Structure 1
């Protein structure tokens, strides 16, 4: 639940470093070490294998500081049109990474912590039930670690 915001911030921080951006927007107010790394790896493999994979989806959202959670939720739900997967869960984290990158390119660095919040919310409401049902994050480590 709050480990979840823990994993969201790790992933986004990692992607922003990777690309030459600042990561200081976050938190600007070991158990999951295996999960965090597995996720980092999974996201990297995903993006290698699909470069421009969220063009449409980001274009649909078009974030600005006036965007609300509901438009985010609505567009994220497109990833999950057939239900939850480990693969669609990895795509969700990449999608969030691509939005934070897009926000920083538009000189809207404020959105980055908003996006993390949104992601943690969404993960907690719609994705945790399925993760719980399908082995928790241990299963995730098993398959991607």
Structure 2
């Protein structure tokens, strides 16, 4: 639950939006600094995207994303991704999916979805991923393995 998850979501989404030429307000070692966690996630996300970006092509069209159906589509995708388990790679996929959904939404003039997606991501992290994260060494461990 800590505020770390929301911080990671905002940093990651802001970063992915910057790669598309967009600036977002961002509103609405057993111990390591969050700056290193953010960096590790940005790097993993980039490597993940370079290797599999075709999987995120036109998600807005595929999922028929609209403001009124966005939440449901997002939740269904993430719930199925984690249906049979959690691991760091799937968590990177989760961040990547959220980032792509954000960028592609702005691309279709549905910018209002950015802050909403950020909130849904934070909430999913804190309510459904945090228990596993903490039991598996926390973000400190993610960095040890992906850093």
**Cα shift readout 1:80-102 (whole Å, capped 9, x = no counterpart):** 23310100000000000000011
CA positional deviation for 1:67: 2.6
Q: 1:62 to 1:25 in 2, by over 3 A?
A: farther
> For the residues of structure 1 that align with 2:32 and 2:140, how far apart are their CA atoms?
14
CA contact (8 A) 1:13 1:26 kept: no
CA positional deviation for 1:78: 2.3
Aligned to 1:138: 140
SS of equivalent to 2:53: coil
CA contact (8 A) 1:10 1:36 kept: yes
Q: TM-score, normalised by structure 1?
A: 0.88
Query: What residue ranges of structure 2 are gaps of 5+ in the alignment?
Result: none
Correspondences of 1:2-81 after superposition (within 5 Å): 2-24=3-25, 26=27, 31-55=33-57, 59=61, 61-67=63-69, 69-81=71-83
> For the residues of structure 2 that align with 1:69 and 1:91, how far apart are their CA atoms?
18
Q: 1:107 to 1:54 in 2, by over 3 A?
A: same
SS of equivalent to 1:126: helix
**Cα shift readout 1:5-34 (whole Å, capped 9, x = no counterpart):** 111000000010112122235459982001
Q: TM-score, normalised by structure 2?
A: 0.87
Q: RMSD across aligned C-alpha pairs, in angstroms?
A: 4.3
Q: 1:92 to 1:19 in 2, by over 3 A?
A: same
Query: What residue ranges of structure 1 are gaps of 5+ in the alignment?
Result: none
Give the number of equivalent residue pairs. Answer: 145
